Design a binder for this molecule. Structure first.
Ligand SMILES: [Mg+2]
Length: 165
């Protein structure tokens, strides 16, 4: 009920409670790192390879990602093939380091019993400050994620960076 049976990660509803608490505990001059993560071409993989193969790709991501996180970092299912990452007390440099490490590591991953072409991630990153609301921050992250996707995927974009037009 707290975890996703497939990946072993926290599920969305539990994450929201964890992240909500962490945000309320946030001191004036401090911040958390927050990111939304999409597994690129998941539907294409599921379509060509089948549902069980898609499951193995979700599980491969979870395994890869766990190895990138610190003690106290939180990663959860967000819905579909999307994931949400909270890095307590992290700044932009740390958040970007983590997300780039995840991106590169997933690209190098090898899911058992599948022969996918390319695995890649798109990531939208933002920072969480005291007095922010979690749902508005998730919205901000999702905007950066949109830019990552529209920009060709396999990339991390952030709300603190200049956008295109
Ligand atoms: Mg997707």
């Amino acid at each position: 009920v707290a975890t996703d049976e497939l990946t072993g990660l926290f599920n969305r509803r539990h994450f929201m409670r964890m992240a909500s608490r962490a945000l309320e505990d946030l001191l004036p001059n401090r911040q958390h790192g927050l990111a939304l993560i999409d597994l690129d071409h998941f539907k294409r993989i599921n379509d060509r390879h089948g549902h069980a193969a898609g499951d193995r790709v979700l599980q491969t991501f979870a395994a890869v990602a766990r190895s990138c996180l610190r003690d106290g970092d939180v990663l959860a299912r967000y819905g579909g093939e999307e994931f949400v990452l909270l890095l307590p007390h992290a700044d932009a440099e740390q958040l970007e380091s983590c997300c780039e490490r995840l991106r590169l590591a997933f690209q190098q991953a090898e899911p058992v019993g599948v022969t996918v072409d390319t695995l890649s991630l798109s990531v939208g990153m933002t920072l969480l400050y005291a007095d922010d609301d979690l749902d508005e921050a998730l919205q901000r992250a999702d905007q950066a994620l949109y830019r990552a996707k529209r920009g060709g995927r396999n990339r991390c974009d952030a709300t603190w960076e200049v956008t295109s037009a």
